[PDB]
């Protein structure tokens, strides 16, 4: 039962910068015979199968750039990436192969960019949905950095907790931003009963939160 | 070239069993071991076990003893993994890997992965609803419209806008489960001029329910 421990769980750095991460074994992965550590490094991009970068603690496979540099020994291993590019956005896994095989929990790598506040947009329910028996209000907090964001629902100015569903994209490859779909979900009656709906969004970009709203009355 | 080809996504009812292939090509199948690896959506990689194809011999991670049985078929160059009495805890993408030559013990060639969803849910065409803003846009800049696919199972749907022309400033969001039915959403931002002057139609396709739904964005 060789357990692997990886750290940090998640990281951001800006292009051209250098970054490092540690894999930590629960046992010695050197062998007295052979004098090699059985620890390898994998990179996994979204929607992709893992790709081996380094094996035997420190050996690059064909086509693995010099910037990627694995190192350490015994129980304390480290992967290192310098001149980090937009295309290095991945999760990085270590894997012990001394006895059976065991994977680290991984370290997630996100590109850092200039703090951009989200562009927010709210949308009432559709006729067709209203007809059917339900009523959904949707908010979009599109193209923002950093990842940490607080959404907030109000019906006639009084916060609403229940019925809310969020979904997030991974960092966009092109424009290095995150985006979010907050969906408040109601009934015909309740929706038709109250009048004004508000989407509130607090993001370190501003101390006063960004607010968009609509009054049902108008059309 | 060396290749490992795994099948497409499978939907299976709880309690049943699922047997998935990894077909080998471009090397002597018998010489290398085949490893299997599990990955729950947004989660890490988990080693299931290794098989020695000529021998037939297997090694498992404690955790999968009793759940996963690995086999080989020398005549097909095809490795198989079978999971028995599946619960939704076995819903995941499963990869096969070939270990590299030498003493390396690293996985240099990977399959694409086979997706397993375990659920007692049933085929359900998506409900598409066009998402229009409440009040007209001010003169300048851009307006954001939407489409809201709700009520489908199983994954996936494919959302496109005006048959694919509109690729700039789309965000289709990862689906989220709500009581056996997925709901997702797409956004599209466009020039204040083009909407509502032009036509905007989201095109939502569900291969699983044999359904395609083109829906136009109307303002009032």
CATH number, domain of A135, equals 2.60.40.10
Please choose, from the candidates A103, A100, A104, A113, the residue with its C-alpha nearest in 3D space to the C-alpha of residue A147: A113
**H-helix or E-strand spanning residue A198:** strand A196-203
DSSP state of B197: H
Is residue A130 within a helix (H) or strand (E), and if so which, with residue range?
helix A127-132
Best of B131, B157, B202 to disrupt the A interface (most A CBs within 10 Å) is B131
**A95 HSE (CA, 13 A, CB side):** 29
Q: Which two tokens stand for residue B31?
A: 């010489």
CB A137 within 8 A of CB A186: yes
Q: How many domains does chain A have?
A: 2
Minimal CA separation from B83 to chain A, in Å: 20
What CA–CA distance (Å, rounded) separates A181 from A137?
Answer: 10
Question: Which segments of chain B does DSSP mark as H helices, in order?
Answer: 194-197
Q: Please give the sequence-ordered ranges of beta strands (E in DSSP) within chain B, or none if there are none.
A: 3-6, 10-12, 18-25, 34-39, 46-52, 57-60, 68-73, 78-83, 92-99, 107-110, 114-118, 127-131, 142-152, 158-161, 170-172, 176-178, 181-191, 201-206, 211-216
Residue B114, chain A, CB below 8 Å: the answer is no
User: Are A133 and A208 within one domain?
Assistant: yes
First to last CA, chain B: 57
A90, B45 Cβ separation under 8 angstroms: no
Domains of chain B with bracketed CATH: 2-121 (no CATH), 122-220 (2.60.40.10)
Domain boundary among A65, A86, A113: A113
Give yes or no for a contact between B95 and B7, defined as CB atoms under 8 angstroms apart. Answer: no
Do the beta carbons of residue B121 and residue B180 sit within 8 Å?
A: yes
Cβ(A59)–Cβ(A121) below 8 Å = no
Could B127 and A129 be called an inter-chain contact, meaning their C-beta atoms sit closer than 8 Å? yes
Cis link prior to B154 (omega < 30° from 0)?
yes
Mutate to test the interface with B, among A181, A186, A196, A218 (most CBs of B within 10 A): A181
Beta bridge partners of B70: B81
Cα-Cα-Cα-Cα dihedral sign, residues B161, B162, B165, B168? negative
CA distance A6 to A18: 18
Residue A131 token pair: 């007809």
What pairs with residue B176 in β-bridges? B183
d(Cα B48, Cα B79) in Å, to the nearest integer? Answer: 14
Taking the C-alpha atoms of residue A148 and residue A160, their distance in angstroms, rounded to an integer, is: 20
* Interface with B, mutate which of A123, A125, A162 (most B CBs under 10 A): A123
Q: Do A140 and B35 touch (CB under 8 A)?
A: no
Experimental method reported for this structure: X-ray
What is the Cα–Cα distance from A80 to A71, expressed in whole angstroms?
Answer: 8
Residues A109, A4 within the same domain? yes
Contact A213, A122 (CB under 8 A): yes
Is B178 in Cβ contact with A49 (below 8 Å)? no
Tell how many helices (H) and how many strands (E) occur in chain A.
2, 19
Residue B103 touches chain A, beta carbons under 8 Å: yes
Where among A113, A140, A168 does a domain terminate?
A113
Q: Which of A50, A56, A66, A4 is nearest to A31 (CA)?
A: A56
Whether A100 and B127 lie within 8 Å, measured CB to CB: no
Q: What is the largest CA-CA distance in chain A?
A: 79
Sheet of A158-159, strands arranged across: A158-159, A150-155, A196-203, A206-215
Nearest to A115 by CA among A211, A8, A20, A14: A14
Same domain, yes or no: A9 and A46: yes
Q: Which of B35, B173, B176 sits opposite A101 (nearest CB)?
A: B35
Task: Compute the C-alpha angle A170/A119/A134, nearest 5°.
Answer: 80
Hey, what are A119's tokens? 């562009």
Q: Is A137 exposed, middle or buried (0-12, 13-18, 19+ CB in 10 A)?
A: buried
Residue B203 in contact with residue B131, Cβ under 8 Å? no
Same domain, A71 and A125: no
Q: Tell me which DSSP letter residue B194 carries.
A: H
Same domain, yes or no: A1 and A82: yes
Cα B6 from chain centroid? 13
Q: Does B137 contact A at CB distance below 8 Å?
A: no
Q: How many CB atoms lie within 10 A of CB A189?
A: 8
Co-location of A161 and A87 in the same domain: no
Q: Are residues A108 and A119 in the same domain?
A: no
Domain span holding position A123: 114-216
Domain match, A11 and A50 both: yes
Q: Which of residues 6-35 of A touch B (CB under 8 A)?
A: 34
Backbone angles phi, psi at B73, to 5 degrees: -140, 95
- In this structure, the dihedral spanned by the alpha carbons of residues B25, B27, B28 and B34, taken in order and rounded to 10 degrees, is -70
**Residue A196 shares a structural domain with residue A185:** yes
For residues A124 and A62, state if they share a domain: no
Mark yes or no for CB contact B44/A142 under 8 Å. no
Alpha-carbon gap, residue A119 to A210, rounded angstroms: 9
Contact list in B for residue A101 (CB cut-off 8 A) is 35, 47, 50, 61, 105
Do A106 and A119 lie in one domain? The reply is no
Whether residue A75 is found in the same domain as residue A145: no
Q: Which residues contact A109 (CB under 8 A, 6 or more apart)?
A: A11, A12, A13, A19, A81, A84, A88, A89, A90, A91, A92
Element (H, E) at A127: helix A127-132
Omega before A215 within 30 of 0, i.e. cis? no
User: Is the CB of B175 inside 8 Å of chain A's CB atoms?
Assistant: yes
Count of alpha carbons within 13 angstroms of residue B209, beta-carbon side: 21
B42 inside 8 A of chain A by CB: no
Tokens representing B115 are 């997706």
Q: Is the bond preceding residue A146 a cis peptide, omega within 30 degrees?
A: yes
Backbone angles phi, psi at B90, to 5 degrees: -90, 5
Domain-ending residue, one of A98, A113, A128: A113
Residue with tokens 């009934």: A187
CA distances from B161 to A93, A125, B218 (A): 36, 20, 14
């Amino acid at each position: 039962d060789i357990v692997m421990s990886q750290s940090p769980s998640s990281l951001a750095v800006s292009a051209g910068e250098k970054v490092t991460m540690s894999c930590k074994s629960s046992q010695s992965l050197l062998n007295s015979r052979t004098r090699k550590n059985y620890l390898a490094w994998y990179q996994q991009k979204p929607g992709q199968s893992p790709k081996l970068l380094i094996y035997w603690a420190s050996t690059r496979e064909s086509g693995v750039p010099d910037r990627f540099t694995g190192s350490g020994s015994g129980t304390d291993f480290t992967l290192t990436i310098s001149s980090v590019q937009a295309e290095d956005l991945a999760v990085y896994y270590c894997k012990q192969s001394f006895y059976l095989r065991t994977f680290g929990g991984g370290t997630k790598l996100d590109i850092k960019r200039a703090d951009a506040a989200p562009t927010v947009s709210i949308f009432p329910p559709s006729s067709e949905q209203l007809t059917s028996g339900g009523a959904s209000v949707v908010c979009f907090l599109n193209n923002f950095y950093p990842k940490d964001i607080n959404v907030r629902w109000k019906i006639d100015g009084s916060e609403r907790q229940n019925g809310v569903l969020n979904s997030w994209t991974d960092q966009d490859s092109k424009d290095s931003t995150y985006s979010m779909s907050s969906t408040l979900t109601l009934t015909k009656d309740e929706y038709e009963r109250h009048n004004s709906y508000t989407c509130e969004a607090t993001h370190k970009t501003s101390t006063s939160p960004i607010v968009k709203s609509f009054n049902r009355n108008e059309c | 070239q060396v290749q490992l080809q795994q099948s497409g996504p499978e939907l299976v009812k709880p309690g049943t069993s699922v047997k998935m292939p990894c077909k080998a090509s471009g090397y002597i199948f018998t010489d290398y071991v085949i490893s299997w690896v599990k990955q729950r959506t947004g989660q890490g990689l988990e080693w299931i076990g290794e098989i020695f194809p000529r021998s037939g011999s297997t090694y498992y991670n404690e955790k999968f003893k009793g759940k996963a049985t690995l086999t080989a078929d020398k005549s097909s160059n095809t490795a198989y993994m079978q999971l028995s009495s599946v619960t939704s805890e076995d819903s995941a993408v499963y990869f096969c890997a070939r270990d590299y030559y030498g003493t390396s013990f690293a996985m240099d060639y990977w399959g694409q992965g086979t997706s397993v969803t375990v659920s007692s849910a049933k085929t359900t065409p998506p409900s598409v609803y066009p998402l229009a803003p409440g009040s007209a846009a001010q003169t300048n800049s851009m307006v954001t419209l939407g489409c809201l696919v709700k009520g489908y199972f199983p994954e996936p749907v494919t959302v496109t806008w005006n048959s694919g022309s509109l690729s700039s400033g789309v965000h289709t969001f990862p689906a989220v489960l709500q009581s056996d039915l997925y709901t997702l959403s797409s956004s599209v931002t466009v020039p204040s001029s083009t909407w509502p002057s032009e036509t905007v139609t989201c095109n939502v396709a569900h291969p699983a329910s044999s359904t395609k739904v083109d829906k136009k964005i109307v303002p009032r």
